[PDB]
């Protein structure tokens, strides 16, 4: 109870320093999300972790506990024996989730017999080797090559948090805490390894495929008004369906198949925005409308499959709305600033500079305005970390709640090899 | 008397010969004119037709400065009805924001006591 | 005698046809000196309708430039109003929702703190 006095202290500070300009809405909301996150951290107010093995016993034949106790071999077979070897462009499709099935079983009964300092090993050695294979794949076998290993990996942290439900409600000081903690543990060093591999795979995947499609030319180009982009858009779609296929030809989790499509957009969002203040070339209220409408078709293919699509492309669908309303009153602008909530003043100063009206020295951007920005620009800059950034980077959230277990289908598309196969027999 | 009243006969016939020929020459020139008054009486109906069409080409391009210059006048209004109507929204939030803060102010008080 | 008889009647028959010819060459003169007056007036009337027609030509292009002109302004305006409005929606749609999200957390935070106060 004593500690109910440390909170009230460090706090008596965050309010005097809490309650220098009439900052706008966008600024206030952040201000808030911060006081809130803070206050919470203050409500949950560590020293020496250690790896430990536990006693055997239960469903552990005199041969079972024997195979386990020989890590050196189940691995190599998993690793170099078949996993590394597997040609994705050619897996019966019968067993698709093979690798995951396999990888689990081992981890499964390895844990059953409390030989953790034996599994941690296995799994850690496995992760490094999957990652590898991904960071290898050909510029082609980069499509159904990625996916295949990802949905397989997306299941690991899940069939980890599930392998938790098991040893929980018990209450034993050894085969519970040390364990509940190695599994609650695994969930993490797996989730990391999955996301990180996914983010570097997706990114890479989009680069290569964005050229196959040549998306720029169809949605951020003047040269193309023609229903010819409707002809190339056709290819785009002909391509997305293909991509859709894959995910399914490879039992990709459901709320995953989804994150993927949002992410897909996100990258395109960045890339589409980035080039919008690079190639582009000259911006014009009309040019906006062309590109806004082009963006319509692009989103058109997702309307049906996922929910709330346009929030991913906010950075550009917004960006474009701007161009679409050339402003000349500093006041108007000043009043409508609260509008564009996705771009920081910095990028606006970008979109807006690269603007000249082909209207013929007619619809020219004010100087009064361009100023307001440069100013706002400077103010913010010192006010927080050191220059806001213009170019848009591309990154995706975690897959924490979008991964999923389901022993069901796993087995429904899983067969086997050598050493493991016999390791499953002797299990139960 | 039959040689002189014969002369007067030879004179008249000869004169009637001339007098009837310049009558020929005349009506032959009145014919050609009737032709140019009939040709440049057509060109007066050719222009009177291109005119009545530039009469309908102007009634159209005039029933436009009306329609057009009006839907554009209308717009102005509606574009300003949106702007003014924003003042009203920035507030809704500014105040909605302040309301959310009291919920935090009062809360931060519950912690320092 | 009887010869000068069919000679006089033969000459007086020419005098009648000379005065008949003369009668008709005067009319065929009234015509040509009259078609000329109406051919010089319709020669004039033709340039007054060709100069008046050149004004319809100038007033045609002059008014076609306005029409065509105005047209663009309409689009420019339409896209402008549109964009503006279509945004004011995201604006609200986004903030009202960001606010509610927020208020939500405060309510939640407060609950797990009024709960750690009653136990």
Swiss-Prot record, chain A:
Subunit: Interacts with SHE2 and SHE3.
Protein name: Myosin-4
Anything else known: Present with 2210 molecules/cell in log phase SD medium.
Null mutant phenotype: Abnormal localization of ASH1 protein to daughter cell, with protein mislocalized to mother and daughter. Decreases HO mRNA level.
Limits of the Dilute domain: 124-379
Residues of the full protein shown: 1016 to 1468 of 1471
Family indicated by similarity: Belongs to the TRAFAC class myosin-kinesin ATPase superfamily. Myosin family.
Function, as annotated: Part of the mRNA localization machinery that restricts accumulation of certain proteins to the bud and in the daughter cell. Recruited to specific mRNAs including the ASH1 mRNA, coding for a repressor of the HO endonuclease, via its interaction with SHE3.
Compartments, as annotated in UniProt: Bud
Curated annotation (Swiss-Prot), chain C:
Source organism: Saccharomyces cerevisiae (strain ATCC 204508 / S288c) (Baker's yeast)
Gene, per the UniProt record: SHE3
Function, in words: RNA-binding protein that binds specific mRNAs including the ASH1 mRNA, coding for a repressor of the HO endonuclease. Part of the mRNA localization machinery that restricts accumulation of certain proteins to the bud and in the daughter cell. Required for the delivery of cortical endoplasmic reticulum into the emerging bud.
Subunit structure: Interacts with SHE2 and MYO4.
Domain of life per record: Eukaryota
Protein name (Swiss-Prot/TrEMBL): SWI5-dependent HO expression protein 3
Subcellular location: Endoplasmic reticulum membrane
Positions in coiled-coil regions: 4-119
Membership in a protein family: Belongs to the SHE3 family.
Miscellaneous: Present with 1010 molecules/cell in log phase SD medium.
